[PDB]
Design a binder for this molecule. Sequence first.
Ligand code: HEM
Ligand SMILES: c1ccc(-c2cnc[nH]2)cc1
Length: 405
Amino acid sequence: NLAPLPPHVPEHLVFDFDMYNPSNLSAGVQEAWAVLQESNVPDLVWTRCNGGHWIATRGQLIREAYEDYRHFSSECPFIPREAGEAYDFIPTSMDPPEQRQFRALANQVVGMPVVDKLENRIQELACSLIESLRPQGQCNFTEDYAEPFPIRIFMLLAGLPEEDIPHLKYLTDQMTRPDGSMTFAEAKEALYDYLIPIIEQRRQKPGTDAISIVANGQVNGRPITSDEAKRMCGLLLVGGLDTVVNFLSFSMEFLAKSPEHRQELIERPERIPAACEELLRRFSLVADGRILTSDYEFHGVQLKKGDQILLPQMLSGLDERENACPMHVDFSRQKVSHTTFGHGSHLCLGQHLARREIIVTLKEWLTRIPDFSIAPGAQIQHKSGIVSGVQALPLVWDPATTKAV
Ligand code: HEM
Ligand SMILES: c1ccc(-c2cnc[nH]2)cc1
């Protein structure tokens, strides 16, 4: 389903990429997207899928568009338009300087200090889940660890019931990797039907959880409104539920195939941090974009006010002009260039949480289960969308090679 090419688009800039269903999906998600960086594809292309939009395919362009909020606005950050239109998440749907007050608050809830505080639970939960897995010789990493780990830590943080996971997780999946079962607005509304009664309660009777801190916070000297709180909380949910979850599966899938990488980390633990950056570069997974605020000429292409452009954060680090041998995971790269957690004013506030969770998972898993692989005859499937994922990850191992700690 291709939308008719608008007038201002040179037919030579057409490249019909479906961000919801790239062509080389079988090969892997990052590999499927990276077709945008072949010699045949211009730096800035137009796809007729998902109703027509620009895509910047290079690190240099993505970074620039990101920095440039004057021209490229977050007002409508999602493709398709209706999805970007229906989204009113804060601070994500706002530009500086408005953005800034809301961000400062969100930072209170997720920043460094909170991670430092939660660190012992993070470690506790990872050890406990792993130890629980170990003797079995087999899981579903996606369901058995990558889902529970990051999620139970978020629920804890936000003061929400474990019982709500199944429910929330579905709604969140609908937003980043729309199924067709429900539109974006419906998905947004139901998540919202959820939070509303909750924020009500925490404005009345405050706790120490994130929702309470958000719901009772100050923004530009006055108190945040219920609607504003609803809107920040929405973002927190998706970030909390949907990101690290998918990140871990790509990473683990990689580790399950690369014994030598496992070993390197086992013998030279001082490398964990450096490896974490490299996996963040290679298994980058977020693709969103911006809306043009006017007619503007970018890198020789004429953009019309109201044109949406996808600025795949995933693509910067997979670019050869930024990283030599981009598809190759190398723990000792002198410089790991990426924009995994974004660029410009919208840099991810929850990056600290995310890294802490990755490093723990690697350090702890490898410790107990140093030798593992993918189940013989399992075919791993990735999924594409705003945030990409792994469908299932069946792992197998000999319990006899594990070590209980
Ligand atoms: C490994 C996982 C993660 C990745 C790759 C990721 C990536 C991103 C990206 C690319 C952006 C900017 C989007 C834009 O510019 O449109 C962003 C923003 C955001 N992220 Fe993350 N994120 C992750 C995890 C998290 C977590 C765990 C949280 C906290 C619950 C979170 C909270 C946020 C917030 C609050 C913003 C908005 C910042 C602003 O608008 O000022 N993220 N993230
Ligand atoms: C949709 C909404 C939120 C996000 C996100 C921000 N940080 C992590 N995930 C990604 C897509």
